[PDB]
Amino acid sequence: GVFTYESEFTSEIPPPRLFKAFVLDADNLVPKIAPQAIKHSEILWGDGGPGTIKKITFGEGSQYGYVKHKIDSIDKENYSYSYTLIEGDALGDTLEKISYETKLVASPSGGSIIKSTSHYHTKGNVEIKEEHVKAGKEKASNLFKLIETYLKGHPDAYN
């Protein structure tokens, strides 16, 4: 009853810089690099640690479009991030518990590798739609390629 999807890519920007921006600065990194997807970010629980809850908002239009992220684990030393999503118009009336996992590393060419993964938990006996899970792979991957330019252009970004 759970879906498992993983991705793998790399970048020339350092993972500790993109990590701090993605986890320790996602409140102003996503709404600044891509203001077309998220419009605001306000942690609802804790402050980013495990068990915390972040309320990300979108601005695709007037209709309110936001989601809730529950931090699951973090690796400021390995540059890894893991949280659980509980809200999101994309969950349709079938999905419920969402699991999100992201990991960063370094390559032999100096660049840095980025491994991401996500899961779904539908309530009852239903399944997600490829166009949905597949489209999410581009919404999460494309963003990762936007942050790489964030540090590749901003040598001061939390650095």
Side-chain angles (χ1 to χ4, degrees):
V2 180
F3 292 65
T4 315
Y5 296 114
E6 73 180 2
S7 198
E8 300 190 348
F9 41 105
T10 44
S11 200
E12 285 182 2
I13 286 84
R17 289 200 63 186
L18 158 280
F19 187 75
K20 279 187 194 190
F22 220 43
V23 193
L24 283 85
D25 245 19
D27 291 348
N28 67 97
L29 212 293
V30 176
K32 190 192 175 174
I33 288 196
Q36 309 169 91
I38 280 108
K39 182 182 59 164
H40 138 122
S41 289
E42 174 192 8
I43 303 191
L44 286 189
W45 262 57
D47 245 334
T52 268
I53 305 176
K54 281 175 205 176
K55 185 192 189 97
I56 287 172
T57 36
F58 308 131
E60 297 170 351
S62 65
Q63 295 175 329
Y64 210 46
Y66 69 81
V67 286
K68 288 195 176 130
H69 282 204
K70 183 190 187 201
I71 299 292
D72 214 4
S73 74
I74 267 155
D75 259 1
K76 294 187 201 159
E77 322 196 334
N78 323 263
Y79 314 149
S80 340
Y81 187 49
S82 331
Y83 47 92
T84 301
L85 170 89
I86 73 178
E87 201 158 351
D89 180 12
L91 303 175
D93 67 354
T94 43
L95 283 288
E96 280 307 327
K97 288 189 191 89
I98 284 313
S99 251
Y100 269 109
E101 190 185 357
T102 301
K103 228 198 158 128
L104 292 145
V105 205
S107 86
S109 294
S112 78
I113 311 154
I114 302 147
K115 195 182 180 253
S116 199
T117 306
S118 313
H119 309 274
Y120 293 65
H121 298 262
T122 27
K123 165 195 88 236
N125 195 73
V126 298
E127 297 184 351
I128 298 91
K129 269 181 212 113
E130 296 189 350
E131 165 181 13
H132 188 216
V133 59
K134 191 181 183 94
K137 291 190 190 182
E138 291 181 352
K139 292 179 187 130
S141 295
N142 290 338
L143 201 78
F144 274 121
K145 299 177 180 280
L146 279 178
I147 307 185
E148 294 170 355
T149 290
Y150 188 82
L151 302 171
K152 164 186 201 158
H154 309 234
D156 300 341
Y158 22 86
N159 149 111

